[model samples]
Target: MKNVGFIVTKSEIGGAQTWVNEISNLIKEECNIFLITSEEGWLTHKDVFAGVFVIPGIKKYFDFLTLFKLRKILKENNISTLIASSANAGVYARLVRLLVDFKCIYVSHGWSCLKSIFCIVEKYLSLLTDVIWCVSKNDEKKAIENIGIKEPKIITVSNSVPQMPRCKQLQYKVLFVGRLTHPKRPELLANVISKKPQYSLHIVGSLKKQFSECENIHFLGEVNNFYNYHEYDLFSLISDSEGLPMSGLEAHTAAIPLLLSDVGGCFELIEGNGLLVENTEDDIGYKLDKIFDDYENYREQAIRASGKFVIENYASAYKSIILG
Candidate 1:
């Protein structure tokens, strides 16, 4: 069997990490799989990979020691091919390939070019990548037109989640499942919930910054598994940016309707499944009222959309890319 390695810069619990964990598990039987990361992530405890290698001090910038260590692992493991998840890993993987010969593919969960100097770096780095897996059509377009990558070399593989049973009965509550960071704009949720006091807002992730107290908003910091709270009425991810967020997929899989802002793959996922809102507090509140009006219909649409995002289909798509 051909040895395949997956490289991720840091081990944190998020979309890119989730992508590695899910894809690695699904594709392990086809090849000898190795997971290379800087530190232990949520996937480390799951024990799904054939081999796990931790390279110390690997972060956004280059570290010679870490690169040397990773090069050693790649050579010793006889890895014929490597898949790098996220931008930092892609940079390291491409740089390492100059020293060691292995087919390298980079999956941009969200391109670093969403911001500054990284965009220029990634534009040049695209030339070194043998293949690029973009998580959304929006991202694919950005990579080609913005980053100047050839269309043939890039493929759009939207994120997927396992099928979940639809909630027996939906509540009148609104749910937001993502980091409480600036991009996620938890304050928007706070603002919306504050305006509509009748509907309670439940946040399923941790806060990056403190928020003004909103009586109707409840923060349940970082649930081990968000799918367990499937009873909520609507799932919201009104983020400033994203790359087919896993939380949105999980919510859709559970047949929870969405109320999202016009950003990233949020609009793509919520097209038939739910409502899209302007990023303003007033607009969010207005859309919430509209969504609640046709709640059951949106829930049914979410169930239909969930069928299209099954893990098996996602696995099959990657298998074609890896083995073909």
Candidate 2:
């Protein structure tokens, strides 16, 4: 069997982890697969079909011990092809490639270059990478315009979710599902939900902060399956940057209307199904009012748009990219 390896920077419950888990699960039946993740996280709990290794010291710039251990793993497993799922993972895989013989596919969940100094770093890494897999065409375009990495070298497969049953209304509840970190800008959700006492905001990521004092804001920490929570009428992601978030896709699969900030692959998720909301309380609340007023229209569009991202389509896309 062909030896396939997957590596991710963090084990956090984020899009990259979802990408690794979904793709690894799809191909494990045919390939001898393995997974490497840093600092035990979301993938820690998963009974991944492949052998899972946790390297606590993995770093993008400098981490000698992690590289030594990673190289050893590559040699022992004879990884024929390795897909590095984030910028940090890409650095480790590309650096290790100097010592081991393995083809590398680098997927930057969001183009790190889009931010700052990572641009120069990403450009250099692109030289070492066999192929760069972008999560959205938006990032693919930016690869050409911003980083100077062009086609054949870069391929795009948008984020996806398994087809599932839709959810519906009653309460004016909004849900935000992601880390409360930089570029994520969950503050917008907090501010809007703070003033709009009629609407509720339920968060599904780790309970890291007191986003709002308003009783409307409810923090439901790290759920195994957020889809089972059917009470939410809408899903939101107000980020300054993204590369097609898995949570948004999952929400769309559940036929829940979206209220997303116009960034990253957020537009791709809202192809008539959701609203392209702004980052301010006034603008967001106004759009929230619109979603609340015509809930069924957006809800119907959500289910219709869900067809574009069926998990089989996602699986096959990755298969052809990696297998070829």
Candidate 3:
């Protein structure tokens, strides 16, 4: 049995972790898949996955001992391929692989260096990686330009969508979800909601810190009321950086119009199904206004275009490229 190792740092379940969970579930029947991480504190603690192996205090790559421990796990498991899902894990996995023996694949969820301090660390450690799987072609170019990774070594994989959920809510509301951090650019979203307070905006994510402020926005804060597509009118994300985000794909599956930033993966993830923007509060507000104004027409177009982005585009292709 071929053993594939997935290394992740943060316990929080977001886009990347969810992708790992989905892929692990698919490969478990054929091979021994081991998940190496510390805890599942913030992420969705679902057991849809196969092997759950937790390491202690290896969340960040600051510790050299974690690298040694990971090397030991590689030796013990006899893993053939070590896939790093996030940046922290990607750095450590590559560093550890140097001392061990395994083919390493780094999934660039996004370029942390786009406009954050994380970019500094990513620039240094990224050199240690081998194959880089980009979620969008936009990212592929950036990786080569910034990190000098060859084009052939990098590939674009879209977000996986299987079927469109049967929810046809006709609310002309826009939706946004992600960590309320600077890179996430929630401030831009707040600017939009402030302009169109009447338009229902559903914000689902964990805020890094809370502010006692009101903008007529619905904050779900890691809570989701509507799994069925009938609840939301549109889907959107405003981030300074991204890999292939699942929320956008889910929104696309629901036939919800998208208003995303021109970040790493957003342009390609939408695949002409949605709209992209630059990092301006005015531009963000203007785009949201357009979508809110023309809700029905945009929704119909998005729904039809999203059909091309089903799960085969994300998961099946990912597996075929990686495990095949």
RMSD each, Å? 2.3, 2.5, 3.5
Candidate 3 TM-score versus the reference: 0.83
Q: How accurate locally is residue 162 in candidate 1, as Cα lDDT from 0 to 100? A: 78
Per-prediction TM-score: 0.91, 0.89, 0.83
Which runs in model 2 stand beyond 4 Å of their true positions?
63-68, 113-116, 168-170, 206-213
Expressed as tens digits, the lDDT of each residue in 21-95 for candidate 1 is 778777777888888887887866667677888776667468887778778989999998899986667878888
Rate residue 322 of model 3 by lDDT: 59
lDDT of 2 by residue, 1-324 (tens): 888888887887667787787777777777887888887867767775458888877744558888899999988988888899777788898888888888889986777546547776787778888888888878888787788776768888876767656653458888888877778877678778878789888877734456545788887776756665356788888888777888887887777789999887788888778799778878888988898888888878877776777787778777887876
lDDT of each: 0.78, 0.79, 0.70
Candidate 1 minimal-lDDT segment of 10 residues? 206-215
- The clash count for each model shown is 0, 1, 6
Task: State the displacement of the C-alpha of residue 33, model 3, in Å, after optimal TM-score superposition.
Answer: 1.7
Could you give me the TM-score of model 1 versus the true structure? 0.91
Error of 3 at 259 (Å): 1.2
